[PDB]
Design an enzyme around this catalytic site. Structure first.
Site, PDB file in Angstrom:
ATOM      1  N   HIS A 180     -22.740  -9.240 -44.176  1.00 28.25           N
ATOM      2  CA  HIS A 180     -22.327 -10.211 -43.170  1.00 28.25           C
ATOM      3  C   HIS A 180     -23.554 -10.715 -42.422  1.00 28.25           C
ATOM      4  O   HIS A 180     -24.607 -10.065 -42.397  1.00 28.25           O
ATOM      5  CB  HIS A 180     -21.341  -9.593 -42.156  1.00 28.25           C
ATOM      6  CG  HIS A 180     -21.957  -8.534 -41.290  1.00 28.25           C
ATOM      7  ND1 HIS A 180     -22.246  -7.265 -41.750  1.00 28.25           N
ATOM      8  CD2 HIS A 180     -22.348  -8.557 -39.992  1.00 28.25           C
ATOM      9  CE1 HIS A 180     -22.781  -6.550 -40.775  1.00 28.25           C
ATOM     10  NE2 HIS A 180     -22.851  -7.308 -39.694  1.00 28.25           N
ATOM     11  N   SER A 194     -24.629  -1.172 -30.124  1.00 25.26           N
ATOM     12  CA  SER A 194     -25.021  -2.476 -30.629  1.00 25.26           C
ATOM     13  C   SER A 194     -24.423  -3.601 -29.805  1.00 25.26           C
ATOM     14  O   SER A 194     -23.376  -3.442 -29.169  1.00 25.26           O
ATOM     15  CB  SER A 194     -24.603  -2.623 -32.097  1.00 25.26           C
ATOM     16  OG  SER A 194     -25.095  -3.825 -32.646  1.00 25.26           O
ATOM     17  N   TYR A 208     -20.619   2.952 -32.281  1.00 28.68           N
ATOM     18  CA  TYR A 208     -20.227   3.217 -33.658  1.00 28.68           C
ATOM     19  C   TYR A 208     -20.522   4.677 -33.963  1.00 28.68           C
ATOM     20  O   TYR A 208     -21.687   5.085 -33.993  1.00 28.68           O
ATOM     21  CB  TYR A 208     -20.981   2.314 -34.625  1.00 28.68           C
ATOM     22  CG  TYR A 208     -20.661   0.850 -34.458  1.00 28.68           C
ATOM     23  CD1 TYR A 208     -21.286   0.085 -33.480  1.00 28.68           C
ATOM     24  CD2 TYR A 208     -19.730   0.227 -35.281  1.00 28.68           C
ATOM     25  CE1 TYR A 208     -20.996  -1.254 -33.329  1.00 28.68           C
ATOM     26  CE2 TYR A 208     -19.433  -1.111 -35.135  1.00 28.68           C
ATOM     27  CZ  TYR A 208     -20.066  -1.853 -34.161  1.00 28.68           C
ATOM     28  OH  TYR A 208     -19.771  -3.191 -34.012  1.00 28.68           O
ATOM     29  N   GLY A 240     -18.228  -6.760 -27.700  1.00 37.26           N
ATOM     30  CA  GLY A 240     -19.168  -6.492 -28.763  1.00 37.26           C
ATOM     31  C   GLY A 240     -20.206  -7.561 -28.994  1.00 37.26           C
ATOM     32  O   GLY A 240     -21.198  -7.294 -29.694  1.00 37.26           O
TER      33      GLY A 240
HETATM   34  O1  LIG Z   1     -23.454  -0.382 -36.732  1.00 35.76           O
HETATM   35  C1  LIG Z   1     -22.847  -0.751 -37.773  1.00 35.76           C
HETATM   36  O2  LIG Z   1     -21.968  -0.102 -38.390  1.00 35.76           O
HETATM   37  C2  LIG Z   1     -23.209  -2.114 -38.363  1.00 35.76           C
HETATM   38  N1  LIG Z   1     -24.142  -2.827 -37.509  1.00 35.76           N
HETATM   39  C3  LIG Z   1     -24.386  -4.108 -37.692  1.00 35.76           C
HETATM   40  O3  LIG Z   1     -23.788  -4.741 -38.722  1.00 35.76           O
HETATM   41  C4  LIG Z   1     -25.331  -4.845 -36.748  1.00 35.76           C
HETATM   42  O4  LIG Z   1     -25.807  -4.224 -35.762  1.00 35.76           O
HETATM   43  O5  LIG Z   1     -25.644  -6.053 -36.940  1.00 35.76           O
HETATM   44 NI    NI Z   2     -24.245  -6.781 -38.227  1.00 33.66          NI
END
Ligand SMILES: O=C(O)CNC(=O)C(=O)O
Ligand code: NI
Ligand SMILES: [Cl-]
Ligand SMILES: [Zn+2]
Lengths: 346, 6
Positions: free
Chosen positions: A180, A280, A169, A162
């Site tokens: 965060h 991501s 997701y 990741g």
């Molecule tokens: O995709 C998600 O649920 C949350 N994504 C993130 O916190 C990010 O890409 O930085």
């Molecule tokens: Ni994030």
């Protein structure tokens, strides 16, 4: 202050080809100050011809998101669930009990999210190793971004799921991600492959400390137990509480086919509007190195992401390396400054 | 080890 408001960019195909170069461009435009930026890919660009051949993709560890709290302050507990397929997930998401409520405008959906987030715990298909790209897509390929972050795998030989590899997701209505910054305060990239939108909140890096103080005020026990408890990704704070305590923030909604970029030390949180799929990973620039050096990490848990900054300091900051090893590198970060690669445009 | 939703 628009210098710290979320910016949206519309690159041409020629501009879209070089990823790290375009990131440098948007920083030259001030995009990093918001902590979050949207990038709309040119219409020619497509990453997968169709998303109908993925129904047998397996979601190994669905999580059910139990939320407890009041007055805009909440804590999120995750419950691992039995593995399930994209097909089964889609059916439960588009299901009547977990589908999007009716609404006219985004403000109404947002109101319903903050009013009902503790009821009817949704299921979030998070942290699925994999990619939906095709092997031939060379542009903005989340699997192979080719940034300096790759030094962790190429030279140190380390792979962090990741972080330097892609995650998928699968969201449904009301699934959320808590406040965060990224591991090691890295950059992140997020592409909405298909489905309903994903709404985002962001706090400018130059004001992140303020958010931390606020959170530490509200959860003193959590703060005592851990140096960086927000990295647990369990703390939800509504925009009304942020506005009440004078924390600057902005909001933006990401639509299918759109990229979001998060920047180092940019706090963000949000929620999914309905059934959707996002991919991501993390990435870096030269600017990130100092952030990585100064990141405050989670102290209370074991399998936490810790990247050795040694290789980066050695290669990109040789003249500071000795000093840094001695613990005497007192560099102060200026969150307004663009990454050096942006000098091209300034 | 790895990135996780916590
Ligand atoms: O995709 C998600 O649920 C949350 N994504 C993130 O916190 C990010 O890409 O930085
Ligand atoms: Ni994030
Ligand atoms: Cl507490
Ligand atoms: Zn911790």
């Amino acid at each position: 202050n628009p210098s710290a408001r979320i910016m949206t960019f519309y690159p041409t195909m020629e501009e879209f080809r070089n990823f790290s170069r375009y990131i440098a461009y948007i920083e030259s435009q001030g995009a990093h100050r918001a902590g979050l930026a949207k990038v709309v890919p040119p219409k020619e660009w497509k990453p997968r011809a169709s998303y109908d051949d993925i129904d047998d993709l397996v979601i190994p560890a669905p999580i059910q998101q139990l939320v407890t709290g009041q007055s805009g302050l909440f804590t999120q507990y995750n419950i691992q669930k039995k593995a399930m397929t994209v097909r089964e997930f889609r059916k439960i998401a588009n299901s009547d009990k977990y589908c999007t409520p009716r609404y006219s405008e985004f403000e109404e959906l947002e109101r319903k999210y903050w009013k009902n987030l503790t009821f009817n715990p949704p299921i979030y298909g998070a942290d699925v190793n994999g990619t939906l790209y095709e092997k031939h897509v060379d542009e903005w390929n989340i699997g192979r971004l080719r940034t300096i972050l790759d030094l962790v795998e190429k030279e140190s030989g380390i792979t962090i799921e990741g972080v330097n590899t892609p995650y998928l997701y699968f969201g449904m209505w009301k699934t959320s991600f808590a406040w965060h910054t990224e591991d090691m305060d890295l950059y992140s990239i997020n592409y909405l492959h298909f489905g309903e939108p994903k709404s985002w909140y962001s706090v400018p890096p130059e004001h992140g400390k303020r958010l931390e103080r606020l959170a530490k005020g509200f959860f003193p026990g959590s703060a005592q137990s851990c140096e960086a408890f927000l990295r647990h990704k369990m703390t939800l704070i509504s925009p009304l509480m942020l506005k009440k305590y004078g924390i600057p923030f902005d909001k933006v909604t990401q639509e299918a086919g759109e990229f979001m970029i998060t920047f180092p030390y940019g706090y963000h949180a949000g929620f999914n509007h309905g059934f959707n799929c996002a991919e991501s990973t993390n990435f870096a620039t030269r600017r990130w190195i100092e952030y990585g050096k100064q990141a405050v990490l989670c102290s209370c848990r074991k399998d936490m992401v810790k990247i050795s900054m040694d290789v980066f300091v050695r290669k990109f900051q040789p003249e500071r390396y000795k000093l840094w090893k001695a613990g005497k590198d007192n560099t102060v970060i200026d969150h307004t400054l663009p990454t050096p690669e942006a000098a091209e445009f300034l | 080890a790895r990135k996780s939703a916590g």
